[model samples]
Structures are given as structure tokens and as C-alpha cells.
Target chain A: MVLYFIGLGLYDERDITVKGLEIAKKCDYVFAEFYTSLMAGTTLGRIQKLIGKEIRVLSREDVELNFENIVLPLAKENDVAFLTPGDPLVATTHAELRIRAKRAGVESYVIHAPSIYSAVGITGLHIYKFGKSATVAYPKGNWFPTSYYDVIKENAERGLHTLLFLDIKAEKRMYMTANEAMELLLKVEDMKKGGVFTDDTLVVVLARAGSLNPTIRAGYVKDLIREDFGDPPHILIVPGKLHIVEAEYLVEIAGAPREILRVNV
Target chain B: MVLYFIGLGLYDERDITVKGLEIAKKCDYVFAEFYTSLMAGTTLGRIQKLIGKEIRVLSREDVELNFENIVLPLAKENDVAFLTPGDPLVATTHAELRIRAKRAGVESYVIHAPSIYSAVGITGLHIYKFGKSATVAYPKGNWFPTSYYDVIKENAERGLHTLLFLDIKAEKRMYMTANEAMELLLKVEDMKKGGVFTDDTLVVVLARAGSLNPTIRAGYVKDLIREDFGDPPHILIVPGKLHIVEAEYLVEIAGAPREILRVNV
Candidate 1:
């Protein structure tokens, strides 16, 4: 009787590690939630084919409220799995879910996989330079959600790179594109007048990161605001200063502008 | 005609994703280096058995000096892969290797894996709260490496958690332990007279990440400085301030002090 929190990774079913696949197959019941992040490369049918198990998809409310009643109860008699996009607890508060398992006398294990957050390493910037991470949420109802804009300002003021996770609503099939996120950031900038995310600001867009041909393009927001990065589920990075190597890698591989290569430091 | 930069994932051969495995199997040449990080759960022999390929394990010098002369030459005519542990380009400047590939007219792609950096999410601290990261190095040859100490102070001043990557000389088979990291931090504290890391400072240790049962322990440095974290390749995190949920997860799941269940700040 154990509970496993497995990450489905960023893109496809193929992104699941062999360890996760084997362990997920052994579980008596498998449950997954996708609203926290996007899995643009694979769908429910294919994930089922990969694991050979029918995953009981949970909603935000189901997990927040009925997790102990539904998932932990299954763990009492059978080995259960709760799968999520990226790494468990990275995108959501599921780390607290492990506490629930313990309260119910169930053992929990996390089988890690590729995450969009760490996959930013593929973007040619040093991971050590990245500061606090933030997310852009779709402004709905009475919520403008300009907190992400301030986060970039804070990190940029400190000369540290900021990672902005683009919003996702898998339940409603709403994955924000890099273009939309840039536009939203500009809107917030116009509102706040902080100059944190003006059109001239440098930004990097990573789309479908775990895919074989994932798109990585770095340029000014003015030039890239309308550029198609292909597909859904995008991430944006606002780099604060760049090493020559970092700039060259972006220029050579990600097609960043050559002007960025001239770094004073 | 193609160069694939693949990540072998964390811990074991089974940690590699299906995409990496299948692609590695078909590669004309597969090259891997383990000097950058530790993979205690698996070895080259096992990875070879799984991939059905004879891997060329390179030294740091070999990779740094002769990569263009060796790996790129092979890639010009055949499918070649340069593999590393965790996500490619996360811990190293191998991102610059893509520039060499482009200069040599080789197309390269990165297949990401579960990086230790992202796996810190399993620590229950929100990933967004993490700030700039640094590595703890062994003080040697009149080289008292203490920049990581200031990194902690800088992040702590901003109320951001700091992720400290422990030192590793994999070729020498010297993987830094969390205890070793703590002692080094304490030594740096004594040297700098900074209150960044002290005996009473709260720290979290994550070892053998991506494994089925990782060792996670959280407590004061004085209490856990000499504590055996079970194995090598341990990561240390100095929390700036703890949220109630983070403290609870550390207490219930990581066996942290129950007194921390209620944080003052």
C-alpha cells in the first residue's frame, strides 16, 4: 500500500522515464491531473497506451477536497499513483498531498521526470542566474493578476534572470502562448508604468521544451511579440545581463540577435 | 548529420525517458561523461546493456578539449550523441557545444531529463520562492571558496530560499555529502563573520534525487551537520523563511523538527 507521485514531463508520453512507466504499471490504480501544466505532445489515450492503465483524471476540486476520500482510501488496499505534469509539487501544492498520505498511514514516493522549469536549462542561460519564478494568469472576472510583472521587475532590479510560467487551463483547453504572455506583460507594464516589460526588453521564448524540435528564440519583446513559436504551452525568460557564452549560444542555436553578444561584463 | 545531446536522467539507467532510450539505441555513436555529476544507482555497463550500444565515456579534458575534434567529426557523417547526467546544459556550459556543432555544420537537438535542480520541488518549498543558486566547493590550494556564502546572504536578505549544489569530483570518486557542505558553510560563516549560515540555521537535505526513496531531512545545521545523509550527492537548501505548509511538509514528510510546525515569521 503505497502512493506514487509521478510526473508526466513537459511534452509527450515518451517523456515519462522508464522508472516511472514501470512503477506506474505496477500500481493498482493510477490517477492524474493535467490542469497544473500542459502535456502538448501527448493525450489521455496515448498516455493510457504507454502505461497500459486507465488513469482516473481528477479535477482541481477533486484533489483539493476529495483527495483523502478518493486517492488515500485506494492506497489502504492497493498501490496507488497520482500523476501530474512536470515534477510533482513543482506546479501545484501536491507536496502537501504527501502529508495526506502519511496521515492516512500510507507511504508515498515521488518518481521525478523532466519539468518545464528545469528544462529552461536548455535555453543557454546559467541556471544559477535565475532568481524567483512567477506565473502569468489569465485575467478573468475582476482579477488583473499583475503580480508576475512585479516579480520580473524585482529580479531584473537585482540583475538576476526571472522565469515566468505562462498560464494553463487544461480543463478548458487554454494554454497561453508566448505572444499572449508578452502582450499581457506589456499590458501590466502600461498599467504599472514600471518599465519592467516594455517592448524593448529582452526575452526568451521556449515552446514544447521536451519535444524533439522544441522552439527556442530569444530577442526583444518588440520583435518577438507576434512571432509564432508554434503550438501551445510556452514559457518566457527575462534574462538580466548575459555572459558572452550565453549570448553566443542563444545567437547561434536559438537565433538570438547578434547585438546581445556585446556584454560589458 | 545530427548530434543529439541527451540526458541520462538521475540515479539509474531506468531513469532515462523512453525517448532518450529509443533514440540512444539508434544512434551510430553514443558518448557519455559522468564527471560532472553522480549517478549512484546505475553504471555504464547497465546503461550500455539497456541502450544496446557501446558507449564512449569521456574525461573532462577529453570533452573540454577534443569535443570538436572527436565528437563533431563523428557527427558529420553519422548520428552521434553526447550524453550527460540530469538535464543537458543545466549544470555545465555544454550549451556552448551547440555553437561548435553549428560551426562544423552539424544539427543538434537536446533531449531533456529530470534535472536535480527541478527535483528540488519535492522539498515542499515553493519553486517560485527559490533565488540565485551557488555551489559549495572544497577549499584547497589557498582557495577558500566562500562566494556561495554571500549568495545565501543575498537571497536570505530578500527572503528567498537558496539552493546550494554540493561539490563533486566524480572522477576522483569524491561526491560531497550534505554534512560536508554544512561544515564548509559553517567554516565560511566563521571566516566572513556573516550570519548567513549558522549553527541554528534551518536547512534541508535532499539525497539521491529521482530515486524511489530519496533521503530528505530538515533541521538546524548544528543538529544535522554531522548527520549521515545515507549517501553521496546530497543537496543543501537554506530556507530564508518558511510558509506554514512548507514547514508542515518538512516536519511530517522530511522528519524535520516539529517545533518548526509553527514558524514565527
Candidate 2:
């Protein structure tokens, strides 16, 4: 009797690893939470049919507060699986849940899957060049968060790229667009005058990353802020000075400005 | 007709994503290379049988020199899949290969898979806390690389974890163990005297990730330097100051020293 934390990967049901799917198929019960991230290309019905199990979707409160009460008890008698949108512990809460499972005397294991953190390599930027990542949240009244802007500043100072994970409201079916993330950063730049995110700053946008025809664009924020990147679940990357090869990939593959090879390389 | 760069994922044939497997099965020809990283849990025969294709294995020279001449030519009139261990572009050369495909007028698509880059989340460290990554390369005569040590120092100063990929000589069947990496770092510290990787430094070692039963260990270099961590393809993480939860996970799940809960936390 054990509990499994499986990731469904980036875009759809087919993104699940064969190891994860095989284990989920044999599990007695499967539970999933989507508040952390959303899979844009697949539906609940499709995921259920693929796993051949009737899935019980949990809300944020259900998982963060009552994971032990609802999920751990099942693990005592039968094999149980808990699914998340990406690699299980990338979201801090799941790691804590593993501690909870330990406290409840239930064994837990993690099954890895594709994550936007690593999948961003598709943007043709070097993975090693990325610095500390931060999330761009939807600001509330008088409670705007600018730490994400600071993260970009810190990373830029070291000539490292910054990966900004846009906010997601799975229950509300809302995903933050890269355009909104850039607009928020520009607002922070106005307030802080850090020059971390000006209109002329180069940024890369990746939308629907796991899909075959996902959008990949690189340009100045002035032009890309208004450009349509196709869908929700977008990620924005503020690149530092580029290597020559990186510049070539951005220009040839990601449709970046030709001047990047001269100025930013 | 296109060339697809697919990742076989971390440790085994079973680690391949459902979408990657499905697309690979339909390819007109499949070519795979393992020089970049090793999948210790599976063999070529198993992968070939699973995909129901006659898989062609390539070496570093074959890919670096003749990828355009060999693979791109096939992709012009047929659907060709190029497989690699772990996510394709995580290795720098594969991203360059995509540019080569573009120059040859062949469309290239990347199918995502689980990578040690994201899979490091299984060690209970928050993903966003990781900073610029570096590989612990084997030092040769008069050319010892200490840049990786500098990476750990820079990230530590910023309170960001550093992910260290160990060197692998796949052709020679030589994989650097964590013990060897630790020893090498100690030698570098002795020469540079950079207190960055002292005996008291806390490190995490993950061996055979993507396997059902992987080894996860955490502790100070003094105690862990000589300890065994199972098979190869090991990765080392030199964490900065840890969060309370992270220290707790290290102590409870990864068998780290109990003092870390209070000291590093």
C-alpha cells in the first residue's frame, strides 16, 4: 500500500510519462489537483478515458488542507495515486504533503514528468543560462507584488535569463498571458525605475509549450506586448546578453530581431 | 515529413512520454544517441521493441559531424525521430542541431520529456530556488575547470541552490560518481582556497533518477564524501541556506544529518 505523486506534464494527457501512466493504471484510486497549473490541450474526460479510471478532481483547499484526511486513508489499504500538472514537488505544497504522508505513516513516491521549467529549452535559450525563477502574480488592490521584477533585475545583473511563470486560476479557468506579465513588469519598472524591464528590453514568449505547433516569439517588449501569442498558459523569458549561438537560434527559430545577434550577442 | 527531437527521458524505456512514444512509433526512421546522458535502467533492444522500429544508434561524432548529411536528408522525404536521453535541448549541442535542420530546409519539432533539470525537484528543494546550473567536468592535465565551483559560490551567496551535473564518458563507460566529484571539488578548494566547497558544506546526491527505486542522500561533505550512492549518472546539488521545510525533508526523507534541521534551516 503506497501513494504516488505523478505529474501529467505540460499540455495534455499524452504528455504523461509511460512509467507514470503504467503505475496510475494499476493504482486503486487516482486523484488530481489542477490549481497549481493547467493542461491546455486535454479535458478531464480525455484524461479519465486514457487512464481508464474515474478521476476525482480536488480543489486547492481539499489538497492543501485535507490531503491527509482524504488521500492518505486510502493509501493504508490500497495503492493510491495523486496527480499534479507538472513535476510533483516543483510546487512547494506537494513536498509538504509528502511530509504529511510520512506523519500519517503512509509511504509516498514521486513520478516525474515534463515541466515548463525545463520545457522552456524549446525557446532555444541555454538552460544553464537561466537564473532563479519567480512567479508573476495578479496584483490585488494596493497589494501589488514586485519581487518578480526584482528577481529579473538580480538575474540580469549576473547576465542570466529570468523565467517568469505567469499566474493561473484553475478553478476560474484563467491563465495569465505573457502580455499581461510584461505589462505588469513595465508598471513595476515605472515605479522602481530599475530599467529591469523597459519597453525596449528583449523578451521571449512561449505559449502552449508541449503542443507541436506552439507559438515561440522573441522581440522587444514594445512590439511583443501587443502581439498575439495564440493562447493562455504562456511563459515569458527575459534574456540576458546572448551567446552567438543563442542569438542565432532566437533569430532563426524563435523569430527574434536580427539586431540581437549584433547588439545582445 | 519532418525531423523530431524526442527525449527518452531519465532512466529507462518506460520513462518516455506517451506522446513521444506515439509519435516515435509512427516515424519512418528513428535514430538515437546516448553520449550526452545515460539511461541506466534500459537497453537499446527494449527501446526498439517498444517503439516497434529498427532503431539506429549514433555516436557523438556521427551527430556532431554528419547530422545534416545523415539525419536531415532522411527527414526531407520521411518522418525521422532523433532520440536522446533526457530532454533534447538541455544539452547545448542538440539546440544547435535544430538550427542545422532549419538551414537544411527541414522542419524540426521537439517532443518534451522528463529531465534531471526538473526531476531534481524530487529531492524536495523548491524548483524556483535553483540558480544557474553547471556541470562538474573531469579535470585533465593543466586544464582543471573550477568554474563549476564558482557557480556554487555565486548561487550560495545569493541564497540560491546550484545544480551540478556530473561528467560522463559514455564511450569509455565511465560515469563520475558523487564521491569522485566531491573529491575533485575538495582538490579545487585546496588549490583555490575558496571556502565554497568546504568539508562542512551541505550537499544532496541523487542517483539513478527516473528509476522506481532511486537513491537520495543528503549531508555534509565530510560525512558523505566517501559514502556509497549506488549506480552512475548521479547529480549533485549544493544547496544554499535551506528553508525549514527543505531541511526537514532532507533529514526525514533523505537521511541527512539531524543538525541541518536547525543549522541550515
Quick one: best lDDT, which candidate? 2
TM-score of each: 0.98, 0.99
Q: What are the per-residue Cα lDDT tens digits for candidate 2 across A53-168?
A: 99999999999889988999999899999999978888977888888889989888888999999999998899999999999999999899889999999999999999999998
lDDT of 1 by residue, B1-265 (tens): 7999999888999888889989999999999989888988998899999999999999989989989988999999999998899887897878888889999999999988999998998899988899999999988998789889988998998889999999988778998899998988888888889788898999999999978888999999999998888876799999988889999989988899999988887
Kindly report the root-mean-square deviation of model 2 from the true structure over all alpha carbons.
Answer: 0.9
For all candidates, the clash counts are 0, 0
The alpha-carbon lDDT assigned to residue A62 of candidate 1 equals 94
lDDT (tens digit, per residue) of candidate 2 on B1-265:
8999999999999888999999999999999999999899999999999999999999899999999988999999999999999999895579989899999999999999999999999898999999999999998899999899889989999999999999999999999999999999999999889799989999999999998778999999999999999988899999988999898899888999998888533
lDDT by residue for model 1 (A1-265), tens: 7999998888999998888999999999999987687688889999999999999999989998989998999999999989898877887478899988898999999999998878998899999999989988889999888888888888888788999888877778888889999999889988999878887788999988999988999999899999999987789999998887788878887898877777412
For model 2, the superposed segments whose C-alpha errors exceed 4 Å read none
TM-score of chain B of 1: 0.98
* After superposition, candidate 1 runs with Cα above 4 Å error: A263-265
Clashing pairs for predicted structure model 2, backbone only: none
The alpha-carbon deviation from the true structure for residue B259 of candidate 2, after best TM-score superposition, in angstroms, is 1.0
